[PDB]
Design a protein around this ligand. Structure first.
Ligand code: HEM
Ligand code: HEM
Ligand code: NA
Ligand code: NA
Lengths: 713, 713
């Protein structure tokens, strides 16, 4: 059946904005996962998980009689899809159970792991999500095998369809670099937002870069991809050596024995895949990666044997029984147990990427320190495992249950507790009057609150106006934020704040974070007034102001908007057309297509464009809240053509006279071109739509101002 | 960006069940189109339309100073996508304005027609939908040019994204038959559910079959395609000759001058397409089809000049200026006016498909009668134009406004008015108890109500339990409906109904249509009781019973379920896998994926399967409403394999012992295979889900019972 995608493969896809509708969700519209989890008997779940560890099923027998290693890998792959560039991937939505991740080569036989968990899932039902369960199982595997974890939070609600994520353009699984859709260019530069070296891998190739078994060059890939997953050298060493303290890899015969991945398997396979024709196809005969490595002398117990082995032997390149490059210890005795036959032992072995931890000079120093100070290794791995598994959960206010660590960690972008009375409605009215009397314009107030709030992204729940980080490095310096204008606004707001706070008794005080948002609201109110309309913009206080020391500057860089169509801003020239970037941004903001439409048309007329560009400002009453953008965009009296100087800027001329009326970008004009966007624009550009426009604009404005407000949610 | 569709192109697509979410809809949740339309000043809209007809715009100048022909073609194409096989297409959702239809070759330059209507759309806003306005505009065109229409109903609510429709498997626009994705097989047999001869055409090729200019062979294609749009020979002749009384075709130069269709055009084209490099690119120079024919001496006035010309001349094969086959009148004078140059006239011309109306012997008889009796032609055309434009609107209860024709037409599947008091809640309780006391079983009651209600399809809003047509030909004899069992159930219900109605005073009576549904409700309540759960199933009375004489048996054929996975039924063997047919059925029933899942699992355990097949009946307490289907399907203790006899039937055996536990079809096992459906099955197969399962099953049951209840809308 030929589809619109087939006929017009490069047309914009809006369906990403209408994912996760109430239609596809089996739960009632009022289901609240947090409330269900809070009633879960977490202790009981953990007891059942402990029991499961050594309850081997014949259809996928447990290595060494303990599923712990398999489950640690499962949990680490759940979390390991995360990219700091967009916040997408990670463990937080349980996406390992849907396409494409359920069938990525690097997730081979994790289908078995998840199936082993169905009886527990079934038993506890909606009170524990798959997403939480995959991580909790990892934790319990560690604890069962003697490693004390740093903690655990619940609260990852399940999702019910695949996430729309760009994982790369290759059309061949595991394609090596330099192909027609290469994710690499130049001196091994990985394209943003990707954080893996090949299509269908979690981070790097365990044989080495493009299969070349060089630990030194593999280290480079490890460092780059782990950095793109928010991990530094210490965390990376701790995680790799920590993980590979447990379990084994599987490569007992040739890979050609392994059949279809789960999404390709027959219906009789009932959601499992990679059925293997090699011997028994499982257990002692398992084939997963094609490597056959067991790292330690006690693969089911926490030990310090990983670094003892790494440093205590010299290593020789060899091949697994499937033909994959791996390393064996020169001159070693057979000291490593077999997973199934107590009569068999094996020499120590390592992956190319394990050797990276010794042969990369920077890793070597950390690895040696961990070898010499095993308590440092244990603590670092515990902290890194918690970060790995929680990095996409967002503010600590979302963390649920009795095992949440009290310690506040920098990567959580912490916000101080509020310890004082909040401003009330009378106060908010007084502050808005003061803001409007200061001389700050509608454009300034709306621009600043937009800049503050629109850093949020729902993918990892980072960003937003809480914290007033717009006043700190690096947000205060971002070009999209108009640093000089922003400075002048914040100076004026801080003076208002100081005078208000100085007049209070009790401990009542307003945060700058709140005032920035309230001042935005006043701008929108004033804009509606300018247009002859009474309007009320909702405002909820309770934001607090974070410090610079609570704000990791390098982590914050990934939130910089290098494209924000809502301010008609593009920092540079990208391969991806700007209207595609607009929809991407709308998706991060959690906006539907109607919300995106209404919001952008209003921001244009309120003066939110970077640099006060006239592009898309289709009104003769700037700073008045009207539906002018839509009415003028859709006027057939105007003809549009790209400029000679710049094909991405368009001029709108009177069709009869040739007179220039407007200019616009791709982001502006897509609303008059895309057949679904234009249908939305028509609703807002109709003669009966002014009040609808205002009300819908206020609603979406408020939505954006509240995106990070999990203290209320 | 590589997508799941790329990796696994043959996997089932559920996204067709989650269209039309509240996310994509710009109107509020409470918007009611009928409420808006009923307050429209329809007379004012018509006056504006009338003025438009002769108000030429320079960007698309009106032929003969009158846009009437253009708008008639627009409205005919809006309606002309309709297929009776599945009810998809038609004018009822205004899909002409979205992909792919907005960019089909046969819809070339209707983008201009719709753009001409934006000022009126804009003026009246939400009170008239695009869907309604396209049809109204065609009516006003006809009226303005002296043709009396049969009437008009409003009430087609706008939609906001493209409909999922299979329009064929060709990968090239207009591909001639016999290609690798040919829609023809055998002796020119067009594949169901298609109703056009080439990809991107409305019905047939105006040059002749695959371009061969033979009117006799063209007539075969006309008859076949029009029949597949629910039009018989008289209607077809009336419509083609009626339409081609007006306006002209456009083929003033070569088609290579014409550029990208709208979905492929540049952003600056602002939603229009087919920009032409030929001379002025419009008006006298227009190119649309490539044909250049003007049918009558007064293209802007109703006349009987089409048949005067068709029969008064002999015709010679010639070529348009674009090189298309068309026909000119031998020996004729220049009597046809030019569209722009009042000093030029032209000889009469015809399409190959126009000549079909004279050279096909059956058409010729009707054409001659219309020629000799043009009042008969006008009436037939009026009636057919109404049918064409309303055929997908559903029951007459949906028809809005002051111009609805009072005459009830057989094709409307009419339901008699109710002229008596309805049964109340107590009455319904009495009747449910009487039904259960009769000895009718849960299986009989559920199966019967399912059979009655589940003929509905939301594509054209035909079918459903209203009418009690299950008791009439042909429904009573459909194999899916188990004719002998059905007869015994209906006999028993009719005796209940007789006794109840005989005992009433005051005119109160219950219809059989209502009692069939109420009886099914009693079955579902009893099944819940059998499971240890007391529930009340909602029931709304007010259905009426239609007669055989009010039922077109030939038209009702297309509603026969030849695949109904909800009864594990497949009438024959199809190319399309049965699970794809299940999702198609769910889409026609308007079900989400969760709704489909719940409904199927409950039906299985209630005994709804045709023939009492055990396939999918994964319970040892049949006729109790439990979640056994899901618990048992998802039990990893059971292993599934296709049978030797039939690859589409699977045995489920104990994994340890080999003992046979169950059998199932593809429809059953897809819920344990597809990763999204399995995630749904898990929710309902969880230990906490009994109450949820019952409640959601009752809800979706009631939804299905009420699908055709537009009297309650
Ligand atoms: C450079 C980074 C990494 C690479 C290249 C890598 C590679 C692999 C490979 C190829 C396997 C074998 C899969 C199989 O055949 O069954 C594996 C196993 C495993 N990995 Fe890693 N890994 C990495 C990082 C990590 C991290 C960060 C963790 C956890 C903190 C982890 C924990 C494990 C565990 C526990 C197993 C054993 C699975 C079992 O016993 O079934 N790995 N890894
Ligand atoms: C066998 C069925 C039919 C064939 C093959 C056919 C073919 C065509 C073609 C090729 C055009 C020219 C498009 C262009 O170049 O502008 C056209 C125009 C038109 N058709 Fe038909 N048609 C059919 C049936 C009908 C029906 C059922 C109606 C309405 C009842 C209709 C009304 C019109 C009108 C009014 C025009 C003139 C458009 C104008 O003035 O711009 N057609 N037809
Ligand atoms: Na994420
Ligand atoms: Na339809």
């Amino acid at each position: 059946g030929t589809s619109n995608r087939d006929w017009w493969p490069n047309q914009l896809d809006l369906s990403i904005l209408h994912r996760h509708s109430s239609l596809s969700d089996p739960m009632g519209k009022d289901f609240n996962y947090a409330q269900a989890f809070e009633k879960l008997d977490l202790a009981a779940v953990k007891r059942d998980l402990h029991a499961l560890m050594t309850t081997s099923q014949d259809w996928w027998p447990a290595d060494f009689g303990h599923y712990g290693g398999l489950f640690i890998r499962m949990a680490w792959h759940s979390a390991g899809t995360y990219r700091t560039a967009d916040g997408r991937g990670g463990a937080g939505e349980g996406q390992q159970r849907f396409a494409p991740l359920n069938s990525w080569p690097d997730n081979a036989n994790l289908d078995k792991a998840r199936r082993l968990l169905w009886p527990i899932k079934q038993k506890y039902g909606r009170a524990i999500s798959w997403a939480d369960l995959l991580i909790l199982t990892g934790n319990v595997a560690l604890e069962s095998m003697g490693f004390k974890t740093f903690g655990f939070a619940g609260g990852r609600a399940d999702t019910w369809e695949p996430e729309d994520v760009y994982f790369g353009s290759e059309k061949i699984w595991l394609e090596l670099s330099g192909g027609p859709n290469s994710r690499y260019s130049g001196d091994r530069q990985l394209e943003n937002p990707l954080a893996a070296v090949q299509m269908g891998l979690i981070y790097v190739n365990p044989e080495g870069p493009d299969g070349n078994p060089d630990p030194v060059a593999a280290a480079r890939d490890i460092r780059d991809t782990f950095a793109r997953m928010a991990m530094n050298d210490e965390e990376t060493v701790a995680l790799i050596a920590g993980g590979h303290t447990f379990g084994k890899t599987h490569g007992a015969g040739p890979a050609s024995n392994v059949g279809a991945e789960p999404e390709a398997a027959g219906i009789e396979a009932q959601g499992l895949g990679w059925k293997s024709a090699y011997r028994t196809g499982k257990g002692a005969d398992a084939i997963t990666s094609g490597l056959e490595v067991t790292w330690t002398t006690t693969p089911t117990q926490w030990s310090h044997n990983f670094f003892e082995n790494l440093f205590g032997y010299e290593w020789e390149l060899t091949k697994s029984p499937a033909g994959a490059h791996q390393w064996v210890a020169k001159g070693a005795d057979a000291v490593i147990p077999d997973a199934f036959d107590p009569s068999k032992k094996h020499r120590p072995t390592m992956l190319t990427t394990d050797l990276s931890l010794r042969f990369d000079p920077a890793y070597e120093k950390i690895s040696r320190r961990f070898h010499e100070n095993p308590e440092q290794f244990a603590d670092a791995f515990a902290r890194a495992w918690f970060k790995l598994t929680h990095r996409d959960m967002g503010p600590r206010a979302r963390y649920l249950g009795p095992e949440v660590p009290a310690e506040v960690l920098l990567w959580q972008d912490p916000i101080p507790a509020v310890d004082h009375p909040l401003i009330d409605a009378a106060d908010a009215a007084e502050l808005k009057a003061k803001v409007l009397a200061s001389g700050l314009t509608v454009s300034q107030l709306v621009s600043t609150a937009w800049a503050a709030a629109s850093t949020f992204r729902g993918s990892d729940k980072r960003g937003g106006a809480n914290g007033a980080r717009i006043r700190l490095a690096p947000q205060k310096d971002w070009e999209a934020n108009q640093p000089e204008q922003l400075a002048a606004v914040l100076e004026t707001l801080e003076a208002i704040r100081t005078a208000f706070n100085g007049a209070q008794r009790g401990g009542k005080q307003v945060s700058l974070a709140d005032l920035i948002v309230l001042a935005g609201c006043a701008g929108v109110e004033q804009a509606a007034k300018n247009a002859g309309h009474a309007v009320t913009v909702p405002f909820a206080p309770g934001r607090a102001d974070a410090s610079q020391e609570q704000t990791d500057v390098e982590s914050m860089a990934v939130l910089e908007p290098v494209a924000d169509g809502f301010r008609n801003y593009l920092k540079g020239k990208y391969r991806v057309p700007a209207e595609v970037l607009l929809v991407d941004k709308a998706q991060l903001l959690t906006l539907s297509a109607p919300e995106m439409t209404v919001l952008l048309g209003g921001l244009r007329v309120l003066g939110a464009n970077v640099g006060q560009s006239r592009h898309g400002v289709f009104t003769a009453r700037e700073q008045a809240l009207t539906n002018d953008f839509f009415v003028n965009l859709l006027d057939m009296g105007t003809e549009w053509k790209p400029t000679a100087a710049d094909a991405d800027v368009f001029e709108g001329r009177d069709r009869a006279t040739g007179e220039l009326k407007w200019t616009g970008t791709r982001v502006d004009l897509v609303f008059g071109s895309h057949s679904q966007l234009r249908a939305l624009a028509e609703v807002y550009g109709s003669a009966d739509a002014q009040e609808k426009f205002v009300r819908d604009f206020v609603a979406v404005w408020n939505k954006v101002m509240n995106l990070d407000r999990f203290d209320l949610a």
